[PDB]
């Protein structure tokens, strides 16, 4: 059986703590509780509990039925080097990862596990780790000489790897059965496919493995370039022939992926000119697809990750290198990004040219067509200042939940976008869209302004979200027949309201500023 792993799991034991990835809870006396809380304070993971769960536990496989009946040609699949970087990882989580890879991966395909110690200071990660891994076939340790960060530690590890395919996992993962074959099968069919497992959550407190059932969500972004999940679009459902086929993802949705080593090297690996840590996968995503490259999530490959209990320079760098004439939509909506030192991108431009990468316009149309791209027409986006109360700007401040909870109001003009950033559209909508596509609306028969999700591209614009910015500075709402007016509450607070129109009233006069 060429599916055989290098080491076999012991028989499953349903009496054993956390077997099958089920939740674990211990009965602890009061000293034991103190010990458990101490380790959570130090590790942000329930290490007390991890230490009592088998390093070799089974995870119950709940994948789509078609996944479990797939056949593979083990003689023709590519080999992989598994790369795991760590910094001060607890013993039991670090080792459960290693044993999990060793026990769930076909021996014929697992060339090596390369552990990268990114300048750990835990004493057990010096001598003791090397002694433990000296007993484990194909497991090697590489050590950095300085604190490199996840990406650069990974690069150092990849440099030592000689497998056909690099598979970057992390230091507190547990692999589902059959996780590897679907990645390697696909890359064996298309060497430019960067293929990601579905990343399931392992509970840091209970160690329950929560498997995503059926169709995963996939990766993209909003116009602040913050990562956002979205559902598989109709175009992608229709392109794919089976529901267990790989799914195209506009951006990477986690840190776990398999890529042909030669192909990763050809693309330039990660962007080394990044100085700050974090957010590096946006730049990588754009580069793979524009330089093409496919980025996929594979529904039959599941890896669990213990999620424990900024990087704007990197995000801006991705925009400067890749986004061409669309970067300004980002800067308009995340103004602090304009102030960030994204670094010298001369070498990156040359790499893009050498690789003959396609445009960001191409990316948007072909990779992320649904997504809405703002216009930000000159003179029609920014802050909207009141003529009547000259210190005040239109301002929408909703709770973090309930993005459409509040009413449009006034607040001191600060020039920083966000709650004061708007876009007047060619479809005559006033969009409040630094975060999501929200459209200013007057509900039927009312005289206040709220927000609601904008219509999808190409679909009817409701009558009650149409605004006419008159030549005279009036913001007229033709459906209500009223005009937007500044006023003060009886208590003195500036506010807005819909009033009968009067172009001689300076409280109904407004202007865009940027
Ligand atoms: C830049 C920005 O969004 N600032 C918002 C402001 O516009 C206003 O909504 C206020 C309400 O408390 O919060 C702010 O600091």
Residue numbers in the entry: 58 to 366, 374 to 578
Question: What is written in the article reporting this PDB entry?
Answer:
Three distinctive glycosylation modes have been reported: catalytic domain-dependent glycosylation on “naked” peptides and on glycopeptides, hereafter termed short-range glycosylation; and remote lectin domain-dependent glycosylation on glycopeptides, termed long-range glycosylation. The GalNAc-T4 isoform is of particular interest as it is the only isoform capable of glycosylating two out of the five acceptor sites in the partially glycosylated MUC1 mucin tandem repeat in a lectin domain-dependent manner. In conclusion, we have provided for the first time the molecular basis for the distinctive long-range glycosylation preferences of the GalNAc-Ts, which is based on a very small flexible linker that provides rotational and translational capacity to the lectin domain.
To further elucidate the molecular basis of GalNAc-T4’s monoglycopeptide glycosylation preference and rule out one of the two proposed models, we obtained triclinic crystals of GalNAc-T4 that were subsequently soaked with monoglycopeptide 3 and UDP and MnCl2. The resulting crystal allowed us to solve the corresponding structure at a high resolution (1.90 Å). Within the asymmetric unit, two independent GalNAc-T4 molecules were present. The crystal structure shows a compact structure with the typical GT-A fold and the lectin domain located at the N- and C-terminal regions, respectively. The almost absence of density for the peptide backbone of monoglycopeptide 3, is consistent with the STD-NMR results (showing no significant STD with the acceptor peptide residues) and with the weak binding affinity of this peptide (Kd estimated in the mM range), determined by surface plasmon resonance (SPR) experiments in the presence of UDP and MnCl2. A closer inspection at the lectin domain GalNAc-binding site depicts that the GalNAc moiety was tethered by conserved residues, including Asp459, Asn483, Phe475, and His478, of the lectin α-subdomain GalNAc-binding site (equivalent residues in GalNAc-T2 are Asp458, Asn479, Tyr471, and His474). Most of the interactions are through hydrogen bonds in both enzymes, although they also share CH–π interactions between the GalNAc moiety and Phe475/Tyr471. As expected and accordingly to model 1, the GalNAc-binding site in GalNAc-T4 is located on the right side of the lectin domain, which requires a rotation of 28° with respect to the homologous site in GalNAc-T2.
